[PDB]
C-alpha cells in the first residue's frame, strides 16, 4: 500500500531556511512526478512546484509565487522528495503536503502525505501545561471529562485519549492564539459506570518541544 510521509516542519525565524522531506513507499518512485502543495491555516491549497519522472529527466517547475526561492529535489535511491525553502516570511506559514503527481498518462494527484506544519515567527518554543478536567465535588448516564492544553508555541499539539482507544465522543477544540501562546482543550464523553471505575487518560504531544504527557483524570473524592 502507498505511503507518503512528510517531515521537517516546525518553527523558523523570518529570513531563515528550512528543508522538508517526504518519504514514500509502495509504488515505483521514478515513474512518478511529485508535487508540493501548501495551505495556510483556514485558507486554500496552493500548488508550489513539481519534479518530473525519470522518463522526463527529473526536471523541475515552480509556481511564479516561489520560483527562485524554493527548490525541489529527489533521491531516487531512497524514494524521498525534498523541498528546500529560503528567505522565509510569515506568509510562508502553512501546512506543506507532498502528493504523487503525473506518471506520463493520468492527470491527477493520486496520493497525499499527512502534511507538515511550518511556522515562521520570532517567538521562542514554549511547551504546554497540561491540566486535567474532572467534574467538581458537586457536579446522569454519560460523563464528560477533558484536558486543558495551555500556553504553548508553535502549533501543533496532538491529543488522544487512552492511547487512541477512546476516539468516539471526543471533541478536540482548535487552538486559539492569545498574547503569543496557543491554548486548546479536549473533551471526552464516556458512560458514568466506566469512570472512575476504569482509567481515563489524555495523551498530549508537542513535537516542537518534544513534550510527551499522559494525564490521568482522577475523581475529586474516591
Amino acid at each position: 500500500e502507498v505511503k507518503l510521509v512528510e517531515s521537517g516542519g516546525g518553527l523558523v525565524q523570518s529570513g531563515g531556511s528550512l528543508r522538508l522531506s517526504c518519504a514514500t513507499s509502495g509504488f515505483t518512485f521514478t515513474d512518478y512526478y511529485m508535487s508540493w502543495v501548501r495551505q495556510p491555516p483556514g485558507k486554500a491549497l496552493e500548488w508550489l512546484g513539481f519534479i518530473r519522472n525519470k522518463a522526463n529527466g527529473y526536471t523541475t517547475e515552480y509556481s511564479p509565487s516561489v520560483k527562485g526561492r524554493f527548490t525541489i529535489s529527489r533521491d531516487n535511491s531512497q524514494s524521498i522528495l525534498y523541498l528546500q525553502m529560503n528567505t522565509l516570511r510569515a506568509e510562508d506559514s502553512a501546512t506543506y503536503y507532498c502528493a504523487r503527481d503525473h506518471d506520463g498518462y493520468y492527470e491527477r494527484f493520486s496520493y497525499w502525505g499527512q502534511g507538515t506544519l511550518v511556522t515562521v515567527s520570532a517567538a521562542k518554543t514554549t511547551p504546554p501545561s497540561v491540566y486535567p478536567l474532572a467534574p467538581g465535588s458537586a457536579a446522569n448516564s454519560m460523563v464528560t471529562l477533558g484536558c486543558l492544553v495551555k500556553g504553548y508555541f508553535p502549533e501543533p499539539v496532538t491529543v488522544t485519549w487512552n492511547s487512541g482507544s477512546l476516539s468516539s465522543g471526543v471533541h478536540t477544540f482548535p487552538a486559539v492564539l492569545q498574547s503569543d501562546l496557543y491554548t486548546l482543550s479536549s473533551s471526552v464523553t464516556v458512560p458514568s459506570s466506566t469512570w472512575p471505575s476504569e482509567t481515563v487518560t489524555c495523551n498530549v504531544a508537542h513535537p516542537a518541544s518534544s513534550t510527551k504527557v499522559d494525564k490521568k483524570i482522577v475523581p475529586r473524592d474516591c
Partner: protein, 217 residues
C-alpha cells in the same frame, strides 16, 4: 497564468439532498491532443489531507462513492453530490493540470440537521494549575445545532480573560461544539465563590446554566 474560481464559497444541505458546485478556468482545459479536460476535484475533510475524487473532469477515482459526479468541459465544470451524507462535510477544490497546476479557492460544504440543544459541562481549576498561580475555569458546550450560540460567565452572580473555540461540524451527527475558558489569577479566583457558565441557544428560551462553588470543591 490559469486562474481557477469556485462557487459558492459555502453552502449547507440536508442529508439525502443534492449538492451542486461550480469551477471555472480562465482558459479552456480541453487538451486538443488527448481530447480530455485536465480538471480534477479533491475533497478535504476537517483536519485531513486532500483526497482525489474525480479527474479528467468526469472520471470517478476507485473507492469513490457513486454519489459524486464530475461534469463539464472547456472553462466550466461541476461537481454534483446526490443523496448527501453527514460524512460529506468538507472543502472541495478543483484543480487544473493543463499548464503546470493551479487550485481554485474551494467550496465549503456543511450539513443541515434538526436543532439540537448543547450538553453543558463546567470544570474548576486543577490543583496542579493553582499551585503555579493561575486559575482556568472551562465550559464545554457540546453537540448542538445550529452553530450560533452565546456564552456568558458569571462570577458571584455578576457577568464577567475568556478564550472561545468552536469545532468544525461533526462528520457523524452534524452538530457543533464550543469550549470557553475563563482565566484568572489564583488570588482573584480565591476572592469569589460562584462560577457560572450560561449558554443561550435557540433551542430553549431557558439558558442552560452550569455552575460550581469554590467552597464545595
Amino acid at each position: 497564468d490559469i486562474v481557477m474560481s469556485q462557487s459558492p464559497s459555502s453552502l449547507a444541505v440536508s442529508a439525502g439532498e443534492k449538492v451542486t458546485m461550480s469551477c471555472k478556468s480562465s482558459q479552456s482545459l480541453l487538451n486538443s491532443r488527448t481530447r480530455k479536460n485536465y480538471l480534477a476535484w479533491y475533497q478535504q475533510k476537517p483536519g485531513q489531507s486532500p483526497k482525489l475524487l474525480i479527474y479528467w473532469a468526469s472520471t470517478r477515482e476507485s473507492g469513490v462513492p457513486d454519489r459524486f459526479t464530475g461534469s463539464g468541459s472547456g472553462t466550466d465544470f461541476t461537481l454534483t453530490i446526490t443523496s448527501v451524507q453527514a460524512e460529506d462535510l468538507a472543502v472541495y477544490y478543483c484543480k487544473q493540470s493543463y499548464n503546470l497546476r493551479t487550485f481554485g479557492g474551494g467550496t465549503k460544504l456543511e450539513i443541515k440537521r434538526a436543532d439540537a440543544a448543547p450538553t453543558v459541562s463546567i470544570f474548576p481549576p486543577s490543583s496542579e494549575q493553582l499551585t503555579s498561580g493561575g486559575a482556568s475555569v472551562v465550559c464545554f458546550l457540546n453537540n448542538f445545532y445550529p452553530k450560533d450560540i452565546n456564552v456568558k460567565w458569571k462570577i458571584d452572580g455578576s457577568e464577567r480573560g475568556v478564550l472561545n473555540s468552536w469545532t468544525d461540524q461533526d462528520s457523524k451527527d452534524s452538530t457543533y461544539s464550543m469550549s470557553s475558558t475563563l482565566t484568572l489569577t489564583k488570588d482573584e479566583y480565591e476572592r469569589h465563590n460562584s462560577y457560572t457558565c450560561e449558554a443561550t441557544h435557540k433551542t430553549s428560551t431557558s439558558p442552560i446554566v452550569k455552575s460550581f462553588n469554590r467552597n464545595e470543591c
